[PDB]
Amino acid sequence: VLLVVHLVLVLGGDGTFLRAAELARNASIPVLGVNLGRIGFLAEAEAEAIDAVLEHVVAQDYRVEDRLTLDVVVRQGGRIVNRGWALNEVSLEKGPRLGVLGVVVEIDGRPVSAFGCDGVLVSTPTGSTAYAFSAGGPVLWPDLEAILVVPNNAHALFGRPMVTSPEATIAIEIEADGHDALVFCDGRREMLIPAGSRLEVTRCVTSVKWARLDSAPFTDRLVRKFRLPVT
């Protein structure tokens, strides 16, 4: 049992959760998280109804559901040249003081889209209401089994989000003649994506573990924290 702060417990926020989640996954030990004042999505609770929280983790009140989390590898011609993971997503991204980045999205070996773009977001349903949400994404209910593909500012006619089945092979091909790209996962863990390389995102063998205290619907979080006028 462990704590990361301002079974796994975390007392802070979404930023700290995906920080939490990293090891909690790593150690196949269910993560648990509670808000510390600052409003954030992923946190099952606020820092106000506390005692019950801790108590329930001692009284053993929660569950662990297989949240899709993704494994990312960059490989240089046959040759895996880098590996990663993320609870939220794998953000393919261009440098900042740079221009449009050339990229090919292939799913299950068919290239579904090519374009110039800020980058590509392949996100879990678990993180469907983040950046991918930012990029026009649909909301995915955390318990789905699927992969979310949402391009980042694509100079293209077609960039409609695609949601494929949990078992497919998403590939971003980085143009040779172009620039080194970037990958960040859940906000951290940058890696370099050399031009000519090729991203490849897939489901990771070990999903992370999500400790539900209130076994209530996503619909209850989603409206309250986003402030949906359900009028």
Next chain:
Amino acid sequence: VLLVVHLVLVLGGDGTFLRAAELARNASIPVLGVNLGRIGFLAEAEAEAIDAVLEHVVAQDYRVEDRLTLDVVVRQGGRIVNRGWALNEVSLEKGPRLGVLGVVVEIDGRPVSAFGCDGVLVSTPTGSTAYAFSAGGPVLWPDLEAILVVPNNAHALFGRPMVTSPEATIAIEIEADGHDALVFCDGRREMLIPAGSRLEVTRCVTSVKWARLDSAPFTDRLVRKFRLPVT
């Protein structure tokens, strides 16, 4: 093994499968079909290499996935007054020479959003590439197990497509105080919705049955039928 035209076999189009597959639906027997010149999505075989198909119908060579399908009934407080099912999706539609239709959208029995609109769409993943796509909805992998909610011309701040978990219950309550609506199922099977009714879609217990001949990736159908510019 029956034949239908514009084991189940059909020589027509999308509405011929929905017609064909309609009857087979009750007769538990997997649907299979050939597109008829003019672009048709769900046809595993086309109006060009039709003959060759036959073999799979004679040797009975293909496989069947239980595609998520949806069950719908309109109810006025505890009184289920009608039910429908769908291959593509279930569109609630306002009267035809009418105006915006009054609405509150509930998911998980939780109200997510209220508004006037053309209406709201509830789709099977396979229907995400039909009406829902046109109406602003994302692409879902056909083999998915999940439900898609797309509001139809919603005079709203937010009408983002929602991809729900198959273990859900989507319900739209129709304004009593206003006009009676319409509901369609696979675009066919229209039904009349009393003002004040409550729409309610859920994962259908009896999937449709699919005759897959050539086990290629969905990205190959999606590309040609949609003619995706990987330009």
Next chain:
Amino acid sequence: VLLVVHLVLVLGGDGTFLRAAELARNASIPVLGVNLGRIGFLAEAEAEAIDAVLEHVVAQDYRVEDRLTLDVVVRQGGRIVNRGWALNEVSLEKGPRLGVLGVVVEIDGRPVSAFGCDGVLVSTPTGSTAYAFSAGGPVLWPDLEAILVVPNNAHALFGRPMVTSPEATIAIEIEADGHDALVFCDGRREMLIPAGSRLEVTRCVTSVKWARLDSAPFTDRLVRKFRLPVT
């Protein structure tokens, strides 16, 4: 100075202005109105501080901008068979118990896109916050001089809203080979469109006349009527 209810004065709603403003339209005399409790966009005055308004109607204190309005006629090869005008917009709409409507979209007499759909919308900038908004269209500043094209539930790769120059001619040719459609004007004034017709909208020579009482910024209307979350 005439009064209409759910100088031109009205005590109703958006469709009461469109009704009121309708007749005044021929009578060249600026429209002015008060919203009636339930949210109404175009009302420069509301159902709360109504009385105070009056002054501007008695002292005749306000000003008039010539809001771009549009002229529409349906023609079958050189034969203009009907015409309409609009405050908000001009929606081509498919038959009501029908299916997708066949279409080629031409702007500047150049074909930009073809498809089936619910239909296509042509709007005055003031109509961009009405149907066109709901149908996927952007917000245009009301005082604009420009025309907005928004396709309505278009089974297409690309149906991006188009904001054209007022010095243009937008034309949608309706499939002959298929079904007859419908066209509306301010949602009212429906017209029947023969299959094969050719829709043609252009900058209307005779703008509507606007009675602006309180010279505030449009962002103040837009915020309250829309209730924009600057949260």
Next chain:
Amino acid sequence: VLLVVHLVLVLGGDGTFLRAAELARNASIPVLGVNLGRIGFLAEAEAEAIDAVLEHVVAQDYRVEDRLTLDVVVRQGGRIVNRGWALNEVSLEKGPRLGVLGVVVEIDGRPVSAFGCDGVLVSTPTGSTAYAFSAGGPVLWPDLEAILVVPNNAHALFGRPMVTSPEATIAIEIEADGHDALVFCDGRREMLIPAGSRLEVTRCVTSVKWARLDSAPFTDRLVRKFRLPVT
């Protein structure tokens, strides 16, 4: 008369054009540009029908139309702390190895939207078919008079593009507690946007000059170069 390369003439592409355009504006001298093989939007011609090009610039075949171009100022409390311009746009942007950037969009002194975001794109109609296009933007016909406001990946419920009248005051307020932001214009001319600062985009007194050789419709460029299936 002057040339920038691989009255103003330019022989290269869109990248070089907005490079061209900078001074050509600066020296109130109409810009003119011709493709040099590499496909790009803004260039009136290709490097294949050349002689006529040059010739027409000597025979004086073209025109100069007042393309909206924008003036940008960043000011530190009353105090203008930096000024800019751009033919395309003013891109408000967060650092790259950073997180969501806090920002308030006010038009004509009413704050229309606040959110966390990659940044804000305020673009001319002249550049409507670029990044703003990337960010979900509508296409604006170059000759319009308007300002385009398109947020860059906003963690917000509402980020609908807004098109206001040419004479309004767009303001992005950079949160104090946040991070220094960035501005790039047409790809160049970076400037630093300190937290607590406040962006302010407006029409620049001197529009740039666009030299039309073929006085044809935008619709002709737009379909050909984008490859619109107008089928």
